[PDB]
């Protein structure tokens, strides 16, 4: 039972068109604001604030408690992105651009330290391990018809 007028229309130009659009979307005129009139195809649909559903008050009696939505209120263009099973934009205790610096610094420092420790390795003061039968020539792949150069170990 939804009339054609109720359905979303083109970008509004005249203030009367903006008032009609705000009435259609159940909004105050001073609160209603469309997307910029480029060719992207937004048309009449309002541009709501970019907060996710996690930021909504959980102690309110929402008509849909899991979605935290009320019946009849305008729905954000990107609601399915913000369903709170998904992207969260909630305020953090530590500023963004400070979490990023700390995380990147830690990761880069660990990478550099691993490279340094690779080119300054650690080992015990011992010589190479000695194996009896010409470094086990026959055991590591055979080739018994080549007579390899003998490998000899002496006592010390």
């Amino acid at each position: 039972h939804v009339t054609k007028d109720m359905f979303p229309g083109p970008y509004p130009k005249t203030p009367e068109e903006r008032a009609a659009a705000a009435k259609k979307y159940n909004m105050r005129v001073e609160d209603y604001e469309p997307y910029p009139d480029d060719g992207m195809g937004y048309g009449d649909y309002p541009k709501l604030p970019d907060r996710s559903q996690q930021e909504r008050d959980p102690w309110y009696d929402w008509d849909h408690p899991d979605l935290r939505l009320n019946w009849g209120e305008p729905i954000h263009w990107d609601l399915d992105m913000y369903i709170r099973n998904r992207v969260d934009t909630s305020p953090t205790p530590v500023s963004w651009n400070t979490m990023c610096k700390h995380l990147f610094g830690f990761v880069a420092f660990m990478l550099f330290m691993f490279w340094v420790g690779e080119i300054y390795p650690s080992y015990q003061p011992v010589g190479p391990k000695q194996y009896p039968y010409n470094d086990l020539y026959l055991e590591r792949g055979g080739d018994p018809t080549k007579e390899p150069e003998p490998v000899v170990h002496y006592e010390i």
Binding site: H64, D66, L67, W71, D80, I83
Partner: protein
């Protein structure tokens, strides 16, 4: 193979002579019997095909497709009788007649020995589908969908026809056996390039290829449930079957004519999988899923290896079953709530547990959980692509990550969470719907038990 064709033609007057309240029972019983008869075509040889006559033959590629068609007809009948209860007797008989004619055309298409007969039947399948969509669809968009379904197909197939007759003037035959035995290489000229394009584009638009796929979401969303079932399960596989038949005369041109189509298939597989992540209509999500899986099939056919051909056959069969099941699952909810918006009805596991189990199994087969034949086909195609180029594992890998995501997303949106408070008309699942889901899903696992029946002639 008239022992399968004639019983369907007999289904026609049996439906038109039936008593007004026995049409569904008779049609379902005899459709199931015809499927049982068609089960005998799976006895195939290792060297050549079953050459029944001068007109019809059966290969190891077409026999599972025929079995799938004959098995899909009774499922379509079961799925259709709910929303057609208010219809008049004559219109119900006309709907069943459309379904029967579609089955007959598909059966003759998959077994034609000549390419022009194949073309004629493969175009004849258009009329019943268009009539079903534009007459028994629910919304006003169906008309537009029908137009998009028609011309997109014909703009691809009219050049092919020309090429076909041209070939018959050059080699003297369009018989597939003669064409295979007397094959000659295609030189590198502009004429040969345009012949290749004429021979390929119709099947490309049938798959559909990414960029030529816009007809599919419209047609598969606006159609009634049986229309969507037959469009996703069988009619998309016409392109793959035709491509695997026609590629025998296109070498060695394919070696470099496949590059734009390979790039389109891989990138558009990523793109359609991504599109599935932000979809408000549940049917459109399943349609874009079909597009991604068919892009995989296109890659497999284009790289032209035995492993890729086996993977393509397995993937086509598995996708047919899985996508038909998913469309039926979405249709149950639509019939309950009369809306296709995915977030309208939520928490359905609390209200319908067995249907939730069916949803879980269907979404598990969609993401190709091993050892399902979905996974077997996908893995064979991925291995062949890796042999073709080691970098493909990137794109394919990304696809495997995205698919599961959107698949589980669908499940989590419909079955989990809390139920919508104001929706109070969700009745318990009928025996018919549960039987439909079981008759979809059990053959999938049974085929997993014996996978060489869907692996094709290679």
């Amino acid at each position: 193979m008239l022992k399968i064709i004639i019983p369907t033609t007999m289904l026609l007057p049996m439906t038109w002579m039936s008593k007004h309240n026995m049409i569904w029972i008779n049609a379902t019983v005899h459709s199931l019997l015809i499927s049982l008869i068609s089960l005998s075509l799976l006895n195939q040889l290792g060297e050549n095909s079953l050459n029944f006559s001068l007109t019809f033959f059966s290969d190891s590629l077409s026999a599972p497709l025929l079995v799938l068609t004959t098995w899909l007809l009774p499922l379509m009948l079961m799925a259709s009788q709910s929303h057609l209860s208010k219809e008049t007797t004559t219109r119900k008989k006309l709907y069943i007649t459309m379904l029967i004619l579609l089955q007959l055309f598909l059966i003759m298409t998959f077994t034609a020995t000549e390419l022009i007969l194949f073309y004629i039947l493969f175009e004849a399948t258009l009329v019943p589908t268009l009539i079903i969509i534009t007459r028994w669809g629910n919304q006003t968009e169906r008309l537009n969908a029908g137009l998009y379904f028609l011309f997109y197909t014909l703009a691809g197939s009219l050049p092919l026809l020309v090429a076909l007759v041209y070939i018959q003037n050059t080699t003297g035959s369009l018989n597939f056996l003669i064409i295979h035995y007397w094959s000659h290489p295609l030189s590198n000229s502009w004429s040969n390039i345009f012949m290749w394009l004429a021979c390929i584009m119709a099947f490309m638009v049938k798959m559909p290829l990414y960029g030529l796929h816009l007809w599919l979401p419209k047609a598969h969303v606006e159609a009634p449930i049986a229309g969507s079932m037959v469009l996703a399960a069988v009619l998309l596989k016409l392109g793959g079957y035709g491509m695997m038949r026609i590629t025998t005369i296109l070498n060695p041109l394919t070696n470099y004519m496949a590059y734009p189509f390979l790039m389109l298939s891989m990138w558009g597989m990523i793109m359609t999988s991504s599109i599935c992540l932000r979809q408000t209509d549940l049917k459109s999500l399943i349609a874009y899923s079909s597009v991604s899986h068919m892009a995989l099939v296109i890659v497999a056919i284009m790289i032209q290896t035995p492993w890729s051909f086996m993977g393509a056959t397995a993937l086509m069969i598995a996708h047919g079953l899985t996508s038909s099941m998913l469309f039926c699952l979405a249709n149950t909810n639509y019939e309950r709530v009369h809306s296709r918006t995915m977030i309208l009805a939520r928490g359905l596991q609390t209200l319908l547990p067995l249907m939730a189990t069916w949803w879980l199994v269907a979404s598990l087969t969609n993401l190709a959980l091993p050892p399902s034949i979905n996974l077997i086909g996908e893995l064979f195609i991925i291995t062949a692509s890796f042999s073709w180029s080691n970098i493909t594992i990137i794109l394919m890998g990304m696809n495997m990550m995205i698919t599961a995501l959107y698949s589980l997303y669908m499940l989590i949106t419909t079955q989990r969470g809390k139920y919508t408070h104001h929706i109070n008309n969700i009745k318990p699942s009928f025996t018919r719907e549960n039987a439909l889901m079981a008759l979809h899903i059990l053959p999938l696992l049974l085929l997993t038990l014996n996978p060489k029946m869907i692996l094709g002639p290679l």
